[PDB]
Amino acid sequence: FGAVADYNPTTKTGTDNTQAFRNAVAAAIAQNIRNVYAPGGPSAYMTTGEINLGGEGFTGGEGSRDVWRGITQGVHFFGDGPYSTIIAFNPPNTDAPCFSARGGWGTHSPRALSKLAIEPVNWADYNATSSGTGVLLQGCCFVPVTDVHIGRFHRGIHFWNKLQGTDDPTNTFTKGDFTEFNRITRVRVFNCDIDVDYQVSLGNNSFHGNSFTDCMCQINSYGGIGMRMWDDGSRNAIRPSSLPYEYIANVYNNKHEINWFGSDARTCYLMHIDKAQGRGCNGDMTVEAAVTLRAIGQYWYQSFGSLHSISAINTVVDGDTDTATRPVAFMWMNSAYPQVNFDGTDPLLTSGLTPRQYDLNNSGNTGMELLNIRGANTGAIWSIQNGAALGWILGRRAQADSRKGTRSVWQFSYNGEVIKSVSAANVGLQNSTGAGFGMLGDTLLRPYAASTISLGSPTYPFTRLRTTDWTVDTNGIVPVQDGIKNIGSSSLRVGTVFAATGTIN
Amino acid sequence: FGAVADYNPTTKTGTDNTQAFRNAVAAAIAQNIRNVYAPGGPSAYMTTGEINLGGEGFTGGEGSRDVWRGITQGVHFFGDGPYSTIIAFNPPNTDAPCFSARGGWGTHSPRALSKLAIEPVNWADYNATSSGTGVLLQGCCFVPVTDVHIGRFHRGIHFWNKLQGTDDPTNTFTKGDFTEFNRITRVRVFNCDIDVDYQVSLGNNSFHGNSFTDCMCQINSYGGIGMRMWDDGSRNAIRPSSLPYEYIANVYNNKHEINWFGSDARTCYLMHIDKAQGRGCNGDMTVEAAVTLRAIGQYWYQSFGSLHSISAINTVVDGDTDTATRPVAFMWMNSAYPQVNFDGTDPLLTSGLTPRQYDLNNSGNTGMELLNIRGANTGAIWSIQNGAALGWILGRRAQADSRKGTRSVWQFSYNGEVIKSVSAANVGLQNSTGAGFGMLGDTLLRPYAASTISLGSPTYPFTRLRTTDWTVDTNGIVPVQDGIKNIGSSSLRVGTVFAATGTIN
Amino acid sequence: FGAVADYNPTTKTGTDNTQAFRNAVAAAIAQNIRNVYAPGGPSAYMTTGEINLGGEGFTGGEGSRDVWRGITQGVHFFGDGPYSTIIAFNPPNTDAPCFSARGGWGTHSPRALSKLAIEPVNWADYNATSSGTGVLLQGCCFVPVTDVHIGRFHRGIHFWNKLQGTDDPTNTFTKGDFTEFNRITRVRVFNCDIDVDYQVSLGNNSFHGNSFTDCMCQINSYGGIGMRMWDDGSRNAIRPSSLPYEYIANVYNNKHEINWFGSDARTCYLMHIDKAQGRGCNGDMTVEAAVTLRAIGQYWYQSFGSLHSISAINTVVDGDTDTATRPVAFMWMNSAYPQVNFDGTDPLLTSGLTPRQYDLNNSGNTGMELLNIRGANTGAIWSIQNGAALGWILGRRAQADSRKGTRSVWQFSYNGEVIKSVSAANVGLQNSTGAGFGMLGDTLLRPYAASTISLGSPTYPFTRLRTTDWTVDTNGIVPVQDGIKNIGSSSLRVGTVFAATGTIN
């Protein structure tokens, strides 16, 4: 179709292959041969315009569907290898993607992309901001993107919910654009401003089923964002609708298996949240160099995977996290990074003490551990490292604050000496029926049931009772002081005194 | 080979390409060029018969093996894309697959399939039952199925162990058909009656190593089963062998990473178990809309992954689950759905109370949480939300019933006031040597060792002893009533009384 | 390029296609068409020399990089299918690979390999040692290896850090060869001596981001190693530098999702560690038949995944594991296999008792379990199976030994009768202010604060005090023996005795 690969990096000139690519896509769609091959010629193919991958005129709504509930409009664009074929893209504006998937939502389409590189004509410096998008996905479902490279654009992968439903005059924003179920495997992004961007402007909240696996993301050192989930609030102006979770980007049930590489010099950003929620995600994440997680508002991110980093990971929150839904902003199976020191209210849990979750296997070698006992005798032991002065604590928390503000109730001590009711007085113990004994107001040792429980039996004597002014032992009943303590009283007299001698002194 | 793509959906007529496909497969096998290409012509290829992918006559047993322990019989059938090439399949009967992998077990074969769609000529209504199979896999190992679509068949993926060993006259069912180690990536199934079906009739129990990743399953609303594992009991008739786990489908060490979409109207089914066991599986599962898990008998399913759903998930069990092996029928890292309320036996754990596992990170924001203390002082705290009246309980369970029937032993109370032996009386405490003090039968406070432990010391007095009829304090030793209580007895007399006065009254 | 596929297994003769393959690779590199196609001819292609996949002369250092931070030297070598194309490799020596990736580190290269088999001309017996390498990867990043087979070589996959930096005269070994970020999907290895080998000789410690997924490894029965991570100590001779973790193979943040099949007869090896550390890995592992994990020295392996096996897994350690970093040598989310019986020091935790971690869901049906209570009343219960005589124990551990050597501090008993300070005497309890009561030296029952806490109140009497020689009850104050016990003393006299009678006896 007249496409040649003669891009010259030195002069930044070459043949514009956007028209040839569009003609190839249209011819592939028209004849139902839904695939276009781009061989690895002598140089890169210079492209200045967007490639729709579904043909010009397929920008939104329901695509043309056959009798089998499937979109007929689409092209599988593939090359020769991950770096064998090179596409040099010159974006007309900031949001122009080299490759896009726009149109039919709810069903599969033959649109796919593999084995090539989206890679810029103009390489913007890390100090400045770049323009262009690597791959755009709006209103598309089941669009595989496998074995591709993306380099130094404003956005590497852009999940978008932009268009509003054409039959929505009452502004519900419930029928329209939503992006779900996209497969991205073995994809590299190199120093983009936002490597992955979930954005909704006038579409639905749904971001469901999109999967990342075997991918690496190079976070830009100068304030780059590895992953962003945000709502621009464009539909807020049309309908205020002052409700917190109504206008959000709902990233739920998506897979995030990405190896992140950040910077140890200029505080790069790992995750950015702005009116969006990551709920019930999964996948294992890898981080190198220092990164920080930014949360704006009460919104949060929760995943069923785990992340590991040979680094220090920082966290910044620009508001009060919605504690009525999640304890902390960022959660995983192994760590929850927004760790805040205890507020100065609990006598034991004081300021300067920070809570950290279990980690489920004591990989840190310094935390508590759960163990079972096997062989003959059986039991369960949960243990702490030596030197832990606080010991084992039974505590409680409020709904307003989950981890900070934990109120200690019971303490068992490191040295195994005292069981202490830290926040309550008059502690005691009793049996199944409820009869028992305990303390009362720092002064009394009492039985719970009045005139029921006896001190000592003929089988189990006590051998002595020593009080401040009396002692009852083998020597007899004698006071501590001489001749000041009486036996009986003028109004409360004893009866008969049976003694062997029969005479005082 | 005479194959054309001219299927007409309106009239449901076209050229039958099953013979051309079979001829292409045979020619590929004969010349050892083990690949057949199906381009995306103007329409779908109409197929009426089964494609063996290993040639006609390769239905079971050991395949032809070279000097390198590998099957020589096989074809890699690939097209142009996930939806670029369309195959319209007309099943002769219910169990006829459009594509199959039958034959050699235990080693690899060049059989593979990718980039196409198994998609029906006759679209059965969701009310009625469909006929045909998308992909059949029996007695095959290492058959990759990548980037394919399957639509509205009786079965989408059918793992089968059908044929019995030809050299098995004593009916052991230990040598013969078993399916293991199959790779299924980026595969869609659309409203099939059973999306994935593990079935064994006269073969071995082995279903090992089969992996699902980056796949979505659309569960049929009208009683569709997303995943089924079942034995039809055909070998039970030949040899009764009344043993529970001998004749089962053993789905072990398989990967199940599937995004499920169900229905909120007509109770679709997620997993069905009928004389089969899922043991030591893994993978993360996604569910949307309401689904229910059905378990028939004592059989169970256990996985090392987790599943998440924005929905309510129901569970039905048609018998007593085998508690001697697993606590509940369905288990995961984050949830175990067969949650049954406590039986009305424990005084604390009463009916209307349901147990739920830890969830390992308190993602529900309402459960207990494990925490470590960091910085200077160190300790461990496991805490509960405010309002939990039952507090922290130490309980025990029987082997017959794991979670229901838990017997409470110790209670520590929410308000930090009493340590209660819920199911036992005569509670107490003692030191390392075993000497100590406690209760005895709701009436006695006793030391464990007779005539050993003394009440009070000169260093630590008690200042008073108040009984029902006596009190010993600074005022002296005086009774509660006047002139009825005696000092000594006629048979048990005191000795000498040393008093400063020397005269009564 | 003159390559033909006419290998004869019977005579082990054929045309040597190594020169044709090298010429094809060079021609592909020169014209920037970075892909070479190997169709599935009548037989296997006989190769006697190494294929560089980057051209002859590309053995290390930084590769030729364009203006876009990427290597221009490379070839994507692909065939027709996993077993459609066969390469019969005759290794000149032990370390000769059929396919290799040598050269530029830190950036991506167009080097890739897919859809073929590395498979030997000379099949060595399982008794003897084989020679050759399937795929070698040194100083290469982002080299995908998908859908390939490897058979009976000395090494299947060899990650290597061999070459030292040419500008390193002071022998720091910090600048030079390191292998990171390699993708290996759907790859089979059949009875190799070492299926996967991480080795560093004169390069950096970095082994980061390499991922294994959907792969199976057949461990050789006669002492085969499924996975090895080791340093040969070649740089130790140049610079002694007697530091433990300086010269190691750092396998960190790598994905290990491999289904292992071992042997139940001749003790095959699963993992071998020799001056290397696996830190922060992930992935789910499958094992069949008996395997053993070997650890040499203080080095360890830690992963964020889980492994399952229908077998018994053994563990051998050839030294004292570095407990200052990890508790045990091998750790996972579900198990930690180096389980050693308790040392004979704790009175409760005696020899013959072995600790095992929680497993997070009680999948073993025999261990303790964490549960939440839902519906109206709320609480938390952690429970043990019936018959566990040891009950619930609060214990502590030293840094030198994590699990063995755990010291029991508190016991709560199975029968809910005694709270025992196992390793300490003089146990007691007190309220928030610290005033309370307890034991002291097996003999005394004392209040913590002197002359503060009183025994009994007018509201809560005790009805009796029974000592060895006295009893105070409704009958009065009477001794246990007749006429030997006195009221008062010669030096410590009582005052006035108020009695109704006025006469002794």
Side-chain angles (χ1 to χ4, degrees), chain B residues 1 18-36 51-57 72-75 77:
Chain B
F1 301 92
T18 186
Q19 189 59 222
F21 281 18
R22 270 165 207 183
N23 287 128
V25 165
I29 291 169
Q31 300 306 123
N32 282 298
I33 184 166
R34 314 156 176 175
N35 60 300
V36 171
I51 305 304
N52 210 330
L53 268 188
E56 294 294 328
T72 62
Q73 303 300 120
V75 175
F77 207 107

Coordinates of all heavy atoms in Angstrom, one line a residue, chain B residues 1 18-36 51-57 72-75 77:
Chain B
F1 N -6.0 -27.5 -0.5 CA -6.7 -28.8 -0.5 C -8.2 -28.7 -0.7 O -8.9 -29.6 -0.3 CB -6.4 -29.5 0.9 CG -5.0 -29.7 1.2 CD1 -4.2 -28.7 1.9 CD2 -4.3 -30.8 0.8 CE1 -2.9 -28.9 2.1 CE2 -3.0 -31.0 1.0 CZ -2.3 -30.1 1.7
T18 N -14.5 -30.1 6.1 CA -13.9 -31.1 7.0 C -13.0 -32.1 6.2 O -11.9 -32.4 6.7 CB -15.0 -31.9 7.7 OG1 -14.5 -32.8 8.7 CG2 -15.9 -32.7 6.7
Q19 N -13.3 -32.5 5.0 CA -12.5 -33.3 4.2 C -11.2 -32.6 3.8 O -10.1 -33.2 3.9 CB -13.2 -33.9 3.0 CG -12.5 -34.9 2.2 CD -12.2 -36.2 3.1 OE1 -11.1 -36.7 3.0 NE2 -13.2 -36.6 3.9
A20 N -11.3 -31.4 3.4 CA -10.1 -30.6 3.1 C -9.2 -30.4 4.3 O -8.0 -30.6 4.2 CB -10.5 -29.3 2.5
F21 N -9.8 -30.2 5.5 CA -9.0 -30.0 6.7 C -8.3 -31.3 7.0 O -7.1 -31.4 7.4 CB -9.8 -29.6 7.8 CG -10.1 -28.1 7.8 CD1 -9.9 -27.3 6.7 CD2 -10.6 -27.4 9.0 CE1 -10.2 -26.0 6.7 CE2 -10.8 -26.1 9.0 CZ -10.6 -25.4 7.8
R22 N -9.0 -32.5 6.9 CA -8.4 -33.8 7.2 C -7.3 -34.1 6.2 O -6.2 -34.6 6.6 CB -9.5 -34.8 7.1 CG -10.2 -35.1 8.5 CD -11.4 -35.9 8.3 NE -12.4 -35.6 9.4 CZ -13.6 -36.2 9.5 NH1 -14.0 -37.1 8.6 NH2 -14.4 -35.9 10.5
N23 N -7.5 -33.8 4.9 CA -6.4 -34.0 3.9 C -5.2 -33.2 4.2 O -4.1 -33.6 4.1 CB -7.0 -33.7 2.5 CG -7.9 -34.8 2.0 OD1 -9.0 -34.5 1.6 ND2 -7.5 -36.1 2.1
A24 N -5.4 -31.9 4.6 CA -4.3 -31.0 5.0 C -3.5 -31.6 6.2 O -2.3 -31.6 6.2 CB -4.8 -29.6 5.2
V25 N -4.3 -32.0 7.2 CA -3.6 -32.6 8.4 C -2.8 -33.8 8.0 O -1.7 -34.0 8.5 CB -4.7 -32.9 9.5 CG1 -4.1 -33.8 10.5 CG2 -5.2 -31.6 10.1
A26 N -3.4 -34.7 7.2 CA -2.7 -35.9 6.8 C -1.4 -35.6 6.0 O -0.4 -36.2 6.2 CB -3.6 -36.9 6.0
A27 N -1.5 -34.7 5.1 CA -0.4 -34.3 4.3 C 0.7 -33.7 5.1 O 1.9 -33.9 4.9 CB -0.8 -33.3 3.1
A28 N 0.3 -32.8 6.1 CA 1.3 -32.2 7.0 C 2.0 -33.3 7.9 O 3.2 -33.2 8.1 CB 0.6 -31.2 7.9
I29 N 1.2 -34.3 8.3 CA 1.8 -35.4 9.1 C 2.8 -36.2 8.3 O 3.9 -36.6 8.7 CB 0.7 -36.2 9.8 CG1 0.0 -35.4 10.8 CG2 1.3 -37.5 10.4 CD1 -1.3 -36.1 11.3
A30 N 2.4 -36.6 7.1 CA 3.2 -37.5 6.2 C 4.5 -36.9 5.9 O 5.5 -37.6 5.9 CB 2.4 -37.8 5.0
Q31 N 4.6 -35.6 5.6 CA 5.8 -34.9 5.2 C 6.6 -34.3 6.3 O 7.5 -33.6 6.1 CB 5.5 -33.9 4.1 CG 4.9 -34.4 2.8 CD 5.7 -35.6 2.2 OE1 5.2 -36.7 2.1 NE2 7.0 -35.3 1.9
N32 N 6.1 -34.5 7.6 CA 6.7 -34.0 8.8 C 6.7 -32.5 8.9 O 7.4 -31.9 9.8 CB 8.1 -34.5 9.0 CG 8.2 -36.0 9.5 OD1 7.7 -36.3 10.6 ND2 8.7 -36.9 8.7
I33 N 5.9 -31.8 8.0 CA 5.7 -30.4 8.2 C 4.5 -30.2 9.0 O 3.4 -30.0 8.6 CB 5.6 -29.7 6.8 CG1 5.5 -28.2 6.9 CG2 4.5 -30.3 5.9 CD1 5.7 -27.4 5.6
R34 N 4.7 -30.2 10.4 CA 3.7 -30.3 11.3 C 3.1 -28.9 11.6 O 3.2 -28.4 12.7 CB 4.2 -31.0 12.6 CG 5.0 -32.2 12.3 CD 6.0 -32.6 13.5 NE 6.7 -33.8 13.2 CZ 7.6 -34.3 14.0 NH1 8.0 -33.6 15.1 NH2 8.2 -35.4 13.7
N35 N 2.4 -28.4 10.6 CA 1.7 -27.2 10.8 C 0.7 -27.0 9.6 O 1.1 -27.2 8.5 CB 2.6 -25.9 10.9 CG 3.5 -25.8 9.7 OD1 4.3 -26.6 9.4 ND2 3.4 -24.6 9.1
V36 N -0.5 -26.5 9.9 CA -1.5 -26.2 8.8 C -2.0 -24.8 9.1 O -2.4 -24.4 10.2 CB -2.7 -27.2 8.8 CG1 -3.8 -26.7 7.9 CG2 -2.2 -28.6 8.4
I51 N -12.0 -32.8 13.7 CA -10.6 -32.7 13.3 C -9.7 -33.3 14.4 O -9.8 -32.8 15.6 CB -10.2 -31.2 13.0 CG1 -11.2 -30.6 12.0 CG2 -8.8 -31.1 12.5 CD1 -11.2 -31.4 10.7
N52 N -8.9 -34.3 14.1 CA -8.2 -35.0 15.1 C -6.9 -34.3 15.5 O -6.4 -34.6 16.6 CB -7.9 -36.4 14.6 CG -7.8 -37.5 15.7 OD1 -7.5 -37.2 16.8 ND2 -8.2 -38.7 15.3
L53 N -6.3 -33.5 14.7 CA -5.1 -32.8 14.9 C -3.9 -33.8 15.1 O -2.8 -33.4 15.3 CB -5.2 -31.9 16.2 CG -5.6 -30.5 16.0 CD1 -5.5 -29.7 17.3 CD2 -4.8 -29.9 14.9
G54 N -4.2 -35.1 14.9 CA -3.1 -36.1 15.0 C -3.3 -37.1 13.8 O -2.6 -38.1 13.8
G55 N -4.3 -36.8 13.0 CA -4.6 -37.7 11.9 C -5.6 -38.8 12.3 O -5.7 -39.2 13.4
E56 N -6.4 -39.2 11.3 CA -7.4 -40.3 11.5 C -6.7 -41.6 11.8 O -5.7 -41.9 11.2 CB -8.2 -40.5 10.2 CG -9.1 -39.3 9.9 CD -10.2 -39.1 11.0 OE1 -10.7 -40.1 11.6 OE2 -10.6 -37.9 11.2
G57 N -7.2 -42.3 12.8 CA -6.5 -43.5 13.3 C -5.7 -43.3 14.6 O -5.2 -44.2 15.1
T72 N 5.7 -38.4 17.1 CA 5.8 -37.8 15.8 C 4.5 -37.4 15.1 O 4.5 -36.6 14.2 CB 6.6 -38.8 14.9 OG1 5.9 -40.0 14.7 CG2 8.0 -39.1 15.5
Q73 N 3.4 -38.0 15.6 CA 2.1 -37.7 15.0 C 1.5 -36.5 15.6 O 1.2 -36.4 16.8 CB 1.2 -38.9 15.2 CG 1.8 -40.2 14.7 CD 2.0 -40.3 13.2 OE1 3.1 -40.5 12.8 NE2 1.0 -40.1 12.5
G74 N 1.3 -35.4 14.7 CA 0.7 -34.2 15.2 C 0.7 -33.0 14.2 O 1.6 -33.0 13.3
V75 N -0.1 -32.1 14.4 CA -0.2 -30.9 13.6 C -0.4 -29.7 14.5 O -1.2 -29.7 15.4 CB -1.3 -31.0 12.5 CG1 -1.4 -29.7 11.8 CG2 -1.0 -32.1 11.6
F77 N -2.2 -26.4 14.3 CA -3.2 -25.8 13.5 C -3.4 -24.3 14.0 O -3.7 -24.1 15.2 CB -4.6 -26.5 13.7 CG -5.5 -26.3 12.5 CD1 -5.7 -27.3 11.6 CD2 -6.1 -25.1 12.3 CE1 -6.5 -27.1 10.5 CE2 -7.0 -24.9 11.2 CZ -7.2 -25.9 10.3

